């Protein structure tokens, strides 16, 4: 189960955040800053995996803004990368040529996609087109 997901920019600004653990706001704010500092202080050949406080923090940035996750030390690590790639593909397909501008302005759509795709740190839909159809049906309802 993914403890949290944080879409952060290369400049350090966070564009998305979804934590599955009930933590205090000051603690959450400190954790986010520490994750940004650790990820922002890492090279391009660090394996995209960090064990921060017994949690395999995996980072795989496909653009200037990066992505991060926090999986428990009981599952595979490449599965997190595959889930991140699937989520990126779903986000690109739902909007169409997803870029940085559409993420800050359309964060509400990203949150809804994340909710309809991953719930509770676990996955909700293994496919990539059924989720798109469900999101389109939910949005077209008005």
């Amino acid at each position: 189960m993914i403890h949290f997901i944080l879409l952060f920019s290369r400049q350090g600004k966070l564009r998305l955040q979804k934590w599955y653990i009930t933590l205090p706001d000051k603690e959450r704010k400190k954790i986010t800053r520490e994750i940004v500092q650790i990820i922002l202080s890492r090279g391009h050949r660090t394996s995209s995996f960090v064990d921060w406080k017994e949690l395999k923090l995996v980072y795989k940035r496909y653009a200037s803004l990066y992505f991060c996750c926090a999986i428990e030390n009981q599952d595979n690590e490449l599965l997190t990368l595959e889930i991140v790639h699937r989520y990126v593909e779903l986000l690109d397909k739902y909007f169409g040529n997803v870029c940085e501008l559409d993420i800050i302005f359309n964060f509400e759509k990203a949150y809804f996609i994340l909710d309809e795709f991953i719930i509770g740190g676990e996955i909700q839909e293994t496919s990539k087109k059924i989720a798109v159809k469900a999101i389109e049906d939910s949005d077209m309802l008005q």
């Binding site: 803004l65 593909e89 870029c99």
Partner: peptide
């Protein structure tokens, strides 16, 4: 800029 670039370029 660096933000208008696509995420995966598909």
């Amino acid at each position: 800029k660096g933000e208008n670039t696509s995420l995966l370029h598909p």
